[PDB]
Amino acid sequence: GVLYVGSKTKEGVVHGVATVAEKTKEQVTNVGGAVVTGVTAVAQKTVEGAGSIAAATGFV
Amino acid sequence: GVLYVGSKTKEGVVHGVATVAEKTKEQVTNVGGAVVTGVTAVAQKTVEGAGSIAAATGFV
Amino acid sequence: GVLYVGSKTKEGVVHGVATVAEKTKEQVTNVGGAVVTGVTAVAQKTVEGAGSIAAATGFV
C-alpha cells in the first residue's frame, strides 16, 4: 500500500554531467585487449546492475 | 496497491550530459581487440542491466 | 503502508559531476588487458550493484 497528495516526489534521478576533455593521448600497445571508455550515466528505479566494463585474457 | 493526487512524480530520469571532447588521439596497436567508446546514457524503471562493454582474448 | 502530504521528497538522486580533464597521457603496454575508463555516474532506488570494472588474466 502507498498513497500521496501534492507530493512532488523525485526517485532515481540524475542531473548534469559536464565532462570537458582535452588534448589527451592513449596509445595502448601489445595487449590482449583494452576497454578504454569515456562518459557513462545510468539511472534506475529497481535494478540488478549498471555499467559493467570487463576486459579479458591476454598473452605474448 | 498505489494511488496519487496532484503528485508531480519523477521516476527514473536523466537530465543533461555535456561532453565536449577535443583534439584527442588514440592509437591502439597490436592488440586482440579494443572497445574504445564515447558517451553513453541510459534510463530505466525496472531493469536487469545497463551499458556493458566487454573485450576478449588476444595473442601474439 | 506509507503515506505523504505536501512531502517534497527526494530519494536516490545525483546532482552534478564536473570532470574537466586536460593534456593527459596513458600508454598501457605489454599487458594482458587494461580497463582504463573515465567518468561514471549511477543512481538507484532499490538495487544490487553499480559500476563494476574488472580486468583479467595476463601473461608473457
β-pairing, C53-54 vs A53-54, is: parallel
Q: Which DSSP letter does residue B11 get?
A: B
* Contact in structure between A41 and B50 (CB atoms under 8 Å): no
User: Cα(B48)–Cα(A31) distance, rounded to whole angstroms?
Assistant: 31
What's CA B14's distance to the chain center, in Å?
Answer: 12
User: Cα(C55)–Cα(A3) distance, rounded to whole angstroms?
Assistant: 45
* Contact in structure between A14 and B10 (CB atoms under 8 Å): no
Task: List the resolution, Å.
Answer: 3.4
The residue type at C44:
Q
Q: Which of A27, B40, B33 is nearest to C24 (CA)?
A: A27
Strands (E), C1-60: 53-54
3-state secondary structure string across chain A: CCCCCCCCCCECCCCCCCCCCCCCCCCCCCCCCECCCCCCECCCCCCCCCCCEECCCCCC
User: Cα(B55)–Cα(B20) distance, rounded to whole angstroms?
Assistant: 26
**Nearest CB partner across the interface for A28, out of B3, B6, B34:** B34
* Contact in structure between C56 and B32 (CB atoms under 8 Å): no
User: Cα(A54)–Cα(A50) distance, rounded to whole angstroms?
Assistant: 12
Please give, rounded to a whole number of angstroms, the shortest distance from the CA of C27 to a CA of chain B: 10
- Interface contact flag, A4 B1, Cβ < 8 Å: no
Dihedral angle, C-alpha A37, C21, C50, A48, nearest 10 °: -50
The CB-side HSE value for B55 (13 A sphere, CA atoms) comes to: 30
Grid coordinates 570494472 are at which residue? C53
